[model samples]
Target: PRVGVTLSGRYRLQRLIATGGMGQVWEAVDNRLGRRVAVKVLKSEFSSDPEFIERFRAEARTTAMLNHPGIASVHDYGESQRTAYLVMELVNGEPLNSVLKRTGRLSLRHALDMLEQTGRALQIAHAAGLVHRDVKPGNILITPTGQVKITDFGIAKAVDAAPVTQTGMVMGTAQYIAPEQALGHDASPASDVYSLGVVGYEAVSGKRPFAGDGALTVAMKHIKEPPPPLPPDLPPNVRELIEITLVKNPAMRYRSGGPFADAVAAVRAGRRPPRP
Candidate 1:
């Protein structure tokens, strides 16, 4: 679409923000509401595919239902001229993945802030019975003010819904997936916690815990191998919190996002995290 093109005669496309295999995001103006918004438009081919369209709509609906300061708000969803799009709050921030690439590892103070905000966001979503199947640095946005806002729920599944993921087919990014997710089991709050653990590990270590030449190999490692131990210089409390979440068994991981947030919060305040 052209820079001035309007979708549904309301949102005027301004500039491209990002693109991926599934879709492209554009900064736009909600002409009717006279406000800035971010619009994610599905790829043309995927928009035409029935299953993809269903999934696209599902993401819009699911994200719209989640209301939290740490979550990017969804405003609207619609189709125009064969294109399907979702309108969201325009976040003035950079992806955490990009930030990490530029700065290497973050300070303990920064990492704890990021973790707490993201965890609280997930906590709210989990309470609503939604499981964010994809949780990674790229899905987290860090504002100029240092606030964290978790975004993108394109593959999130309802915890109460029957599993749609088939056996032998994992659905998340390889580096951050939980063992159960690697084995194609249904995702739960624990799965998200596991992914966040990896994110926290990278935020402080400047590297992923596992490495392999291909996605398949890395996923296998997540399923079979234990994460390398944190550096000796790292704080024991922070190290302990990350370790528990990276445990191979889902039942052994932090049971939900709320406690995960609380743990990080406690560490930030110099208090011991509550017992697991």
Candidate 2:
């Protein structure tokens, strides 16, 4: 139940990495394959919840099917002693949040590079008919070599699956959630793009477009308020792209992550993005 023990007789837990609302991520070693891995174990309290267990297994399955340079790879998933765990490729990087904390804002070059990589990853997931319902600074990882990897598929939903989120239930973080998601509407690819837009806004300005004393207030603002203007120093092209993604009307946002990535790529190449 603690570090230094073998889990499922295969993975040897080495150290605790971080803990979240649903589970804890552990730095581990794959005994059979002799490689480092990151293992996520469900919290004991939620392990007994049928819905939680089902969703846990679903996350494992979903992430295992996706293969991309900007997404973490799933190696194995199973239960040991009735405790569910997921083993994934160990990434030698920190969350984008950490990087943002070190520096209030990222340079235009850095922000565009990270945004393009994350957008490409979302494009692949969207092509597979999945929507990453939760997209934020913490969910994006940046490797030492500057590779961007999107992690945490715990709340990702398949397009064809029956909706598990009920009306009135908000599923994503308040600061980065799209207007439709904040209003309890079903999340779509456009929703992901909107959330990414918030991430981009924060990366460029060092602050969220919306804020409040509580989640409800922020959610309300996302639904009703227009985003504040970007800093004067921010590039017009980058500002325009972020604003496009943050449009309150989902129909006005980037249709998908592919187009969002394309726009960012165009900026990186010193070309103007094609108008939507």
Candidate 3:
């Protein structure tokens, strides 16, 4: 089955869409539905961990049960030749990270609009007891209609916990990660909320508040230091919302993303003094 690397006949891999630390995604066709879908194939490194494979299958089922608009839908999952793959909805468009790179930054209104949907998606996932341990601009896809779809949820933990890390080091793009995640702790709903706040701050300022010579330094900042205040031009209420999310005490964070999204809706509609 390992002739350099080939999957079952269920999919004829056309081309790779992207590669991350964990796996490769390819644009593939489903012979059953005759529709295009994205297939994420686990890397060889993960083949040795039966627990991860089991968890991946469970997460795929969890994602499949979710009916929200913002989370990617998982259609199928299985293993062949000792490799696991996820069949998921094919979302067309660039990642938010790509957009950020091209435009330098985003408008305040636009950022909140995107976060509202993203928050909604997170809320749904949280309700389902799913936490996206890794949430960065790269994991968010922006469609032509301006809708956002949060992808790569359960995959992050699987990537971070790969057996190769002899010291059990969790892996993630350091910039947007929450403190606990950096410590290899389980990520929770509030962790995702905090990450969204980090992204929101960067989107409006065209800059990140945290920077470091390396990953450890930044991880320390997330755990030890407080986030510097937003610039004066950013609305105070919106800033308040960011502050609420940035609270190191997870209990102080928004009780649920539903209220957080409502606060954002108020801001977008100009209904009240934002969240501050």
Candidate 4:
């Protein structure tokens, strides 16, 4: 894991925490600041490209400006030793994806709590004129204290807009992608909200709302099919909130995070979500 490697001579790598198609995330120390940080080393295929690195640095800085308890803070971005990395506050947590795998389905109470926190975080980003573009269980980290913090805000935007593309990883991604995005339209705050709805559906149902043999097929399902019915045991209000969020048309859905988060809170209070 290159435990002693330092990027730009300040962040000292300590241990590897996670890995993915993108690259590796390491638990590290900000030696200058004397604090722990999480450093995401981009795959060389991307880092090696100078044009992409410039754009990535700009986007990463924008992401660093976002401040919220429910969103991980991006501290810095740099390229050193021919690799680009983003330094972030280390989250003592696991991805929601890991939790869902073991729990199968979250109870409504817990799921609601997660949705509200996630929604507020989304609201904050949207307010700042940034679209998350990618929102999935894997991006949402759940700390031991039950805090939910979303990560990869700037990274997702950079990846989505960059010409440097990923193959193979598309399959798992389609399950949470919004229809307009699947159709290749530009992602907006609405897309982020739609993806959050998919998260809510998966949390309560123990299954994704759409599935097919391949990524393209699943993407087509998002474009052409209605979601399968949610579990019958769930409350009507819960169904209504999920239903509102998953609307296919961007304008037809709630106006992104604040609207969706408000609806979730309304339902939690036993009040009906009014027209979004």
Candidate 5:
């Protein structure tokens, strides 16, 4: 029913690209701008609350402030028919999550290519003071031609930062979250680096580093257990790159995504990875 309808009389909803527990994202046409874009529609149960809508507006503005080629741009936000929507750049590609599911684990070079692109975006975001609390495969989009764009920067914080909004769980996925985040601490750049490491660990090894009975249990493992080593026979640099990122202590991990991406690129080139 929503298909083909324009939101706020601007973007025309074309197709649903992805959905999650909270909301759905649509490939839409931005009429005024004469281009295609994405529209993320929030649930009415959350949008109906004035408090949540207000905070969402603020977060959207902050998200709009980010400008980088590897990061999707937040263009506009408004309520159409009482539904909250955030307009974003439409990535002409699939989520990295789907890419993995379609193709299984990628070659080390391909995996690191996506990782490096994502890392560059994370560096920009971290520098802007917007930590990607949820730096999982699903939040990263990659074009078939190798362009990677990071999505959903402040959306999680919009929902999970304020408990007054109700139904606040952890902002990020348990399996990919950092130890500090598991303990209910704020996510730093290092926290994001750790999550990025988890993505690399999953991308190359064909499995996540931590898997347990449930989400809470998985988060507990991120806090207490060391990540299982990557599969055998991969280059030592490959294992070593991810190993430092998964460090339990934030101080011991890469300071941010720049160094992490640089290390990955170095390892890809058969050079020694930077030691933390």
Candidate 6:
């Protein structure tokens, strides 16, 4: 069925926003509040799981704690007779994936700006102890005003933490999964930073650093091999930054999102790169 097609009562669903591994997103308005909201309804097949539902509900609190210009705002959530739904601030703009489909890749400055915003948002989320396990172009929403927002947190893990958790299916897209998380380990804030780096790689290079026959093979490669070299056009300093981010060991990754973003911005501003 089409998303937001007036489910149950009169929700007055609008157009479909996004459909991911976890659930579907729809733009809708709350008639009672006379305000617009993005409604995220979980898929039926996985909605019955109690752990998923509980985690989903718990996220409502922590997610809201992460208030930043580049992060989606969660307003409310509840399950009405097993139909779990999330009311989030509606961001009427193109997703990064959609934007990439047109622009192919961003310039060094533009890409660095985008990554800075994403990292700032992640910094806030990290402070809240809520890691965005899923960070990819598809989950980043760019508003018409050019404001970038990182959305779709907790949903993937909530949906997969049940039977699929042990299976190591990788809750979110494989292209951006952290090596440890892809191997069935619980993700940490560092894992989220790893994802940001992966997206940063794609934004700058127009492709992931690795590819294989399937998801598992690619993940194994991340665990075992060094990332492919950056694009030929990339500068030496920028290329060095990419190598730092694509490291196989999480212990060698950035200590936090703040410093990483600051370094990106410094490079774009023609300032010297920070000490690694």
Q: Which candidate is the best by TM-score?
A: 4
By lDDT, is 2 or 6 better? 2
- The C-alpha lDDT values of all candidates are 0.82, 0.81, 0.76, 0.84, 0.82, 0.75
lDDT of 2 by residue, 241-265 (tens): 8888889998887788899999999
* Cα misplacement distance, residue 174 of candidate 3 (Å): 2.0
Query: What count of clashes does model 1 give?
Result: 0
TM-score: which is higher, 2 or 3? 2
Worst 10 residues of 2 by lDDT: 158-167
State in Å the error of residue 207, model 1: 1.2
Clashes of each: 0, 0, 2, 0, 0, 0
lDDT of 5 at 251: 98
Off by over 4 Å in 3: 1-6, 159-169, 271-276
Which one is best on lDDT?
4
At residue 70, candidate 5 shows an lDDT of 92
lDDT string for model 4 (79-190, tens) is 7868889899899888998999999898899999999999999998989887788899999999998899998885654554421122423623678888888877778888
Residue pairs with clashing backbones, model 5: none
TM-score of candidate 1 on Cα atoms, chains taken together: 0.91
For residue 210, give model 4's deviation from the true position in Å: 1.4
lDDT of 5 by residue, 1-276 (tens): 279888888889999987776578899999997898888898887778887777677766877988888988999888886788889988887888888897778898899898888989989887887787788998888887889989887567556443211222454457787878777677888998999999999999998888866567777778888788788889998898889889899999998889889998898899878976
Off by over 4 Å in 2: 154-172
lDDT of model 6, residue 128: 79
Better of 1 and 6 by lDDT: 1
TM-scores for all candidates: the values are 0.91, 0.91, 0.90, 0.94, 0.91, 0.90
